[PDB]
Amino acid sequence: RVDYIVTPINAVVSWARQGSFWPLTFGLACCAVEMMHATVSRYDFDRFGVIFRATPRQADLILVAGTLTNKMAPGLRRLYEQTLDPKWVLSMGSCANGGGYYHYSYSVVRGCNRIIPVDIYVPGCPPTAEALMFGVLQLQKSLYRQINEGEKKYNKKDLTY
Amino acid sequence: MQNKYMQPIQLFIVFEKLNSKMWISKKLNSNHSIALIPSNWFYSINLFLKRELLFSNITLIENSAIDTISYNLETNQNDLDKTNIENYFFKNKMLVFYNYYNYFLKSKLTLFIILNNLNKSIDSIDRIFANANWLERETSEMYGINYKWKIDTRKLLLDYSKIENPMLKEFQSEGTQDAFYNIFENQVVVLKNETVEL
Amino acid sequence: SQRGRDYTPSNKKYLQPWELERKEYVELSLAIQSAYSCKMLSEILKDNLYMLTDYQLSFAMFHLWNHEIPIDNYFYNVISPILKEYITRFDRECNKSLAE
Amino acid sequence: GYIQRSNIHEEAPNTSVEAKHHNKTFYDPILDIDEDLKDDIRLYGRDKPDELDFTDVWESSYQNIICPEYFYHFWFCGIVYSFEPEWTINYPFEKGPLSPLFRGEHALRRYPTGEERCIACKLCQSACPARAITIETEPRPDGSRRTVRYDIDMTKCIYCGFCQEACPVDAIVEGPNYEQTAYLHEDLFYDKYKLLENGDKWEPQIARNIEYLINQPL
Amino acid sequence: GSEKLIEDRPYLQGMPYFDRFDYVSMMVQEHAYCLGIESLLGTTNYSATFTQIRTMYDELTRILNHLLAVACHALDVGSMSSVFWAFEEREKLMEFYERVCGARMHAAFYRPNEVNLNAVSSFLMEDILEFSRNFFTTLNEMHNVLTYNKIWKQRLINIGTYSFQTCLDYGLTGVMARSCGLKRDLRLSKTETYANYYYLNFRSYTGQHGDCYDRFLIRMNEMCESLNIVNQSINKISKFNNIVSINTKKNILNKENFNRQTTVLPHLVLSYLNKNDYNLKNTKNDYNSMEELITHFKYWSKGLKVESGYTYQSV
Amino acid sequence: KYNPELYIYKTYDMAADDPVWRQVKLDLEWTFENIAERRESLGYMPTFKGDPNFWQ
Amino acid sequence: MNHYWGSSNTIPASSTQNNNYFSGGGNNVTIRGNEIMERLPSQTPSQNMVQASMKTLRFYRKFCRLIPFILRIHNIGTKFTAQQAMINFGNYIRERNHYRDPGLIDHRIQLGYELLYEAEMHFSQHTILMQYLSPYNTPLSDRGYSYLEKVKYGNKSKFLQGFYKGNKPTEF
Amino acid sequence: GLWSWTINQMLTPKFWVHLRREGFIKTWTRGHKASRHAHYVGGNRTDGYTKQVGEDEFGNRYYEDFDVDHKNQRRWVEFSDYFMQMWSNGDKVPVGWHGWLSHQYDDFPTRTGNSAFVKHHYLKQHTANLSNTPLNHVPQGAPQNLNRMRFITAQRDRSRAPWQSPKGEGVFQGKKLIVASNSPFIDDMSIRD
Amino acid sequence: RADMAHSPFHKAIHDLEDKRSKLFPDRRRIPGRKAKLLLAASLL
Numbered sequence A: 001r002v003d004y005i006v007t008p009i010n011a012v013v014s015w016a017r018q019g020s021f022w023p024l025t026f027g028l029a030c031c032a033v034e035m036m037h038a039t040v041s042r043y044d045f046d047r048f049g050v051i052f053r054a055t056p057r058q059a060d061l062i063l064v065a066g067t068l069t070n071k072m073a074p075g076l077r078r079l080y081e082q083t084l085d086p087k088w089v090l091s092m093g094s095c096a097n098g099g100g101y102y103h104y105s106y107s108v109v110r111g112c113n114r115i116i117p118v119d120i121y122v123p124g125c126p127p128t129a130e131a132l133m134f135g136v137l138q139l140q141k142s143l144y145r146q147i148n149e150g151e152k153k154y155n156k157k158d159l160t161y
Numbered sequence B: 001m002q003n004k005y006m007q008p009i010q011l012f013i014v015f016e017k018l019n020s021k022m023w024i025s026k027k028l029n030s031n032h033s034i035a036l037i038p039s040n041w042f043y044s045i046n047l048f049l050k051r052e053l054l055f056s057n058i059t060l061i062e063n064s065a066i067d068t069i070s071y072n073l074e075t076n077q078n079d080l081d082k083t084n085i086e087n088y089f090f091k092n093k094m095l096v097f098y099n100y101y102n103y104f105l106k107s108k109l110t111l112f113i114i115l116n117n118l119n120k121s122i123d124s125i126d127r128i129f130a131n132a133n134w135l136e137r138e139t140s141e142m143y144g145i146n147y148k149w150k151i152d153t154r155k156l157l158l159d160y161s162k163i164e165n166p167m168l169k170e171f172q173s174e175g176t177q178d179a180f181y182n183i184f185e186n187q188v189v190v191l192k193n194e195t196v197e198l
Numbered sequence C: 001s002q003r004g005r006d007y008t009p010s011n012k013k014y015l016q017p018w019e020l021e022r023k024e025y026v027e028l029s030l031a032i033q034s035a036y037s038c039k040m041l042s043e044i045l046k047d048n049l050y051m052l053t054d055y056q057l058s059f060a061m062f063h064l065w066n067h068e069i070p071i072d073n074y075f076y077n078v079i080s081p082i083l084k085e086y087i088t089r090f091d092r093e094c095n096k097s098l099a100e
Numbered sequence D: 001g002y003i004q005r006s007n008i009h010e011e012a013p014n015t016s017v018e019a020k021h022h023n024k025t026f027y028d029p030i031l032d033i034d035e036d037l038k039d040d041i042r043l044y045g046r047d048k049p050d051e052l053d054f055t056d057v058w059e060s061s062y063q064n065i066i067c068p069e070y071f072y073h074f075w076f077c078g079i080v081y082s083f084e085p086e087w088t089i090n091y092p093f094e095k096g097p098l099s100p101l102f103r104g105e106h107a108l109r110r111y112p113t114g115e116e117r118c119i120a121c122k123l124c125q126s127a128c129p130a131r132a133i134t135i136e137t138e139p140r141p142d143g144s145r146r147t148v149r150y151d152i153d154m155t156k157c158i159y160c161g162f163c164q165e166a167c168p169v170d171a172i173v174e175g176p177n178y179e180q181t182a183y184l185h186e187d188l189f190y191d192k193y194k195l196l197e198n199g200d201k202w203e204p205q206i207a208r209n210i211e212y213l214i215n216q217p218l
Numbered sequence E: 001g002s003e004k005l006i007e008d009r010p011y012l013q014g015m016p017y018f019d020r021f022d023y024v025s026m027m028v029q030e031h032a033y034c035l036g037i038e039s040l041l042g043t044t045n046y047s048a049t050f051t052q053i054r055t056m057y058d059e060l061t062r063i064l065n066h067l068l069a070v071a072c073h074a075l076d077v078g079s080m081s082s083v084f085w086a087f088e089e090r091e092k093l094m095e096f097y098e099r100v101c102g103a104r105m106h107a108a109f110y111r112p113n114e115v116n117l118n119a120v121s122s123f124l125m126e127d128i129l130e131f132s133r134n135f136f137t138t139l140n141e142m143h144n145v146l147t148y149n150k151i152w153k154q155r156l157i158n159i160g161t162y163s164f165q166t167c168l169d170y171g172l173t174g175v176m177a178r179s180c181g182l183k184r185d186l187r188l189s190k191t192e193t194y195a196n197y198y199y200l201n202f203r204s205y206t207g208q209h210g211d212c213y214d215r216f217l218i219r220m221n222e223m224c225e226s227l228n229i230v231n232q233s234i235n236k237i238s239k240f241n242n243i244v245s246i247n248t249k250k251n252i253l254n255k256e257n258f259n260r261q262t263t264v265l266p267h268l269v270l271s272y273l274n275k276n277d278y279n280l281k282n283t284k285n286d287y288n289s290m291e292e293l294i295t296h297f298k299y300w301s302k303g304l305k306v307e308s309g310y311t312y313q314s315v
Numbered sequence F: 001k002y003n004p005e006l007y008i009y010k011t012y013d014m015a016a017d018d019p020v021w022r023q024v025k026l027d028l029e030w031t032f033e034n035i036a037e038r039r040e041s042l043g044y045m046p047t048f049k050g051d052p053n054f055w056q
Numbered sequence G: 001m002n003h004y005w006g007s008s009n010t011i012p013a014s015s016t017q018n019n020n021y022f023s024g025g026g027n028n029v030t031i032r033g034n035e036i037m038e039r040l041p042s043q044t045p046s047q048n049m050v051q052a053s054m055k056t057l058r059f060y061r062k063f064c065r066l067i068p069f070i071l072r073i074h075n076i077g078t079k080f081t082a083q084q085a086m087i088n089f090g091n092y093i094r095e096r097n098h099y100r101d102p103g104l105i106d107h108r109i110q111l112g113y114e115l116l117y118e119a120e121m122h123f124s125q126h127t128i129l130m131q132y133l134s135p136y137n138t139p140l141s142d143r144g145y146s147y148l149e150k151v152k153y154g155n156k157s158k159f160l161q162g163f164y165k166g167n168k169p170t171e172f
Numbered sequence H: 001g002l003w004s005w006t007i008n009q010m011l012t013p014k015f016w017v018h019l020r021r022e023g024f025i026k027t028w029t030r031g032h033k034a035s036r037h038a039h040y041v042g043g044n045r046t047d048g049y050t051k052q053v054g055e056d057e058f059g060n061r062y063y064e065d066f067d068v069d070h071k072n073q074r075r076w077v078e079f080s081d082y083f084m085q086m087w088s089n090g091d092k093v094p095v096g097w098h099g100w101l102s103h104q105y106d107d108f109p110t111r112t113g114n115s116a117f118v119k120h121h122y123l124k125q126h127t128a129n130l131s132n133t134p135l136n137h138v139p140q141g142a143p144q145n146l147n148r149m150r151f152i153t154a155q156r157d158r159s160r161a162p163w164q165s166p167k168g169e170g171v172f173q174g175k176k177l178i179v180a181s182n183s184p185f186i187d188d189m190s191i192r193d
Numbered sequence I: 001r002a003d004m005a006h007s008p009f010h011k012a013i014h015d016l017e018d019k020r021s022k023l024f025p026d027r028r029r030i031p032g033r034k035a036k037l038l039l040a041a042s043l044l
Ligand code: SF4
Pocket: A029, A030, A031, A032, A066, A067, A092, A093, A094, A095, A096, A099, A100, A101, A124, A125, A126, A127, D158, E020
């Protein structure tokens, strides 16, 4: 008899978490330049509520934008661990997705998924500001929906048992 | 090339012991001249350039090494001349080219030093030109050119705990070591590189 | 450019662009297009007489017309003789140049 | 450089009053007063005036006592510049200006009959700067030159459109689809069937873009 | 490892690597690569030179870089709105640039010695003029808050004062050299002028202190002079005069002409000066010429062969 | 060097602070007005219209 | 001296006193320096293999003197003891004992000193620094060991053991 | 979610005309459909409501008004699905309307008659992002792919096709297990006259 | 020259008086006048 209030509580929590998906102020390369352009007045990420937070301890969205190398992978893992929970991860750009042009480079991490868990990926190299906004919106929709994904089964009284 | 150009023969005049070999081509600009120099009188040449009137107003523009070990003329082999940088590179094992710009003469000079010793050790111009610190550090980190008596031998761009010279003719594109996330260690570990081939 | 080179036309009547280095032709065209004075244009044409071209002369005339550059005593003295020589050197493959 | 110039100085245009290009109001007395300040040694080096002036004293007093930077900045940056219209684009409700040459989602085009446009020339694979396009081709059952597998690793694909630029039969194209966010890095590895479906979805706009682009040199 | 990455790929295969080198300025690096390729080939891009598109793209890239630098410096100093203004201006510039290549910040339109002549619109020039007016307004608005603000002045006055010998020792160039009083610039050097600055008049400002405020003033004056030079270059390829009727003086304006529609003719100079090459390019294609098909195959499979030699080209 | 030309920021308009910049601005305004008038003279504008028969 | 190994680059014991009210002193031979290493001058050219060997021995001693602090700071003391780490490093150095070029030896010594300083500055991850200090032919002492190969390939020659394992994937 | 159209916006002839024409449901739903600005509800000009330039196959209605204060805000589209403020996404647009809405080309999709785009037989309906959804594109060799084994077998058989050894009982002519070959080709020289 | 007054390619040198007056300032900044005014106003 605890799921009745929890479901409205889950919905309110999902709305609140979607409303304050603060991206991490952590950018590296041209993909991050495009992401910064997506923070411009023309591309109002503030309309969806995305405000960049400098500290991982106070951040929720990790916008991995740039190329990862052998000299930055441990730092990326440490930042991912230091990110406050719950956390979401979005890798923007081909380098952050799979290395891109440097997929055959000796000084390339050869994929950000092999270093930290990634929730969403963006294809463009660089992705457009519209592409980054669409990816952020999809991630927000998934986070709002993932809170109550119907994992529990409904009893004979239409109650999640 | 409609501007006033002249060979900097004053270098060999002051040296009075080195057979001067200068080259000027239309591939570069009208104020670019390239000369080969012996490594023995290399610091002496650098000091003489750094502290001489009509030449003291100079600044080091770039510095780069060429792995002349495997640099081979691909086509038009019969077209090689008897005073060609291609033949000179084919003769030697490495060629260090330092390009400076002289504002007093408003010209470009390129000193090419041929390295054949297995150690690839040459004197350091870091104590002469300030920008040569980071440049020589990167050059040593990438090609293994040992700048003797250098200001700083610390690494510049190579990954931490990695001992290699990626900018070498022997090194393959993929390298040998790749870093993954070791759950058994709860951190990033490094193993052999198994790369996908085209 | 001119070192170890002869600016003589191959056709012995008019010098085509194929006989000169493309960089020289491009520089001459740019200089003609950027000539904002009658005296300056006359000096540029006279200095570049060895490598002058009919296309370059046509472009200079077009620029003078478009910019409404005044034709002065310099145009009447220096431009006139070179123009007359070029016109005497014209041919049937100079239809566009002559008409322009 | 490659030509010879005699008169090194490029003389300024003739400033005669009767000149056709004589620019009336070219110089404004209300604006051109730099001759008054042309002698200020302070603008040329660390030295100061040989004698300070009451004007300088008053200017320093205005700068220090009034603290006028705050008021001027609030009046100009805030009150005035806050009144401009918003340049933001309604992203969920509208799309921004996208050029026809937009290298969007990679896709496989086809002839109007629906037959595969790919002629297995390997030009795309030899032209992918990162070798992001992989082809495995054998003779077709009918004998056509078509690939058994055509893969594009979007993780290593720069979406540069070089394959489309060097496409021999206009097979590889860059459709306007830009919302290709993938929740799985494995799903991001598009293949032949996926590319064919993507081209099928957006063939019409791709056809219009192709016609317009061909009409550019035509 | 961009060095080995380019070195292990064909000449065209390493083209976009230059854009990733200078992320803010992707056009200057591409132009430098094209000029170096031409120098190795011993030739020059006649169409690119005649179209002045190289100069326009370099000026746009310089303006974008200056705006981005101003935004970053203002954000670091503490100004949070100049970043937004410069970002809107950069968005407009990138929208203009993408009309030529289809990408906001990595265009890679400049090829070694070939130019995509089809992608040239006079409407682009008109929008460039409108953007120049808007950028002048934006620069005035930006200077209204950073040039005279006492806080900004005290945060930049006599900061990092370098000199001629200091710049010479470490080879500081560009805006740093200009602020240090050094009048060195490859654009206005007779032996180093590259594309179009050797014949156009532009004003360059050099600082007398070598401080942060001097660098900021250099950037602002560079943006203004770049706008002016871009206007001049656009006018150089513009048809300012038309045939006027002998009867009366009314201009004889056509009714079915792009000249009547737009005064700018991006193909006029190339068509008048290089009519043979212009006709050859506009007529024959790889889908119609077997030789052109072989050229397309070689350029897309092995690439054009380059003569052996070492060259150094700076932009 | 013996006769420098100094650009001094004196007015609220950086363009007004340079006579060449003001001239460039006036030229841009005049060119825009002339282009607008030339386009307004026709009253109609051709535009690229694709046809489904093109994809035959 | 003005160097990272200089005597004056030692953290004071007290906020107002170097070592004590009667004498000064500090710990920098076995611990990190007071300030960062701005410059790392190249080793002086040694024209004699004797000088090269002396320099190598000095580098080995310096590395050994910091093995305790390196293990303690990285929380990697469980993998092997300080003596065990020293033995592993000695074996690794013996692996390169075939060198005979003084210039190559000097370059290697400079690179090793730089790497050790990076480890001393904690700029590198512990899991990567364990590669040099790991045991050559023994399991890590921070985790259990399985003798499955030793039991199954009991007294089996190296060739047979390699043949039984397979040098490439058995599926492709 | 209340007051999609404010009193100031409702105090215009355009609001009354739209309400009388399209009804209260449509008048209120437009504010929840494609809210861009309170002053831009149904257009910027107050003389009337902007006409519907077209309709998308997914129920979206595309309109355009030149009275907007922003140049990049000329054409707009209202989606049918408006469950939440951030429920709809930019992937719901049709391929035909994508070029018009993005200012790629001034041509717009037409329902019938002359069409700005071709209509071929192989056309497939555009769908939203299948990522994080069951309809996601499945590579041939993925683990979740229900037939990755067949693809792996085919790829291996390209250069490493295994020998079909006998499986079960069979005749043995001495130490040689008797089994027939399965080569599709037929040796005609062995069976010919 | 486009960098000096009365340039040949200026093409905008015909009767720009009204536009120039509208688009440019019409008063010079007298040094110290605002200073004296503000100080006297503050004291009073
Ligand atoms: S994916 Fe492309 S745009 Fe992004 S950082 Fe890498 S090269 Fe730059």
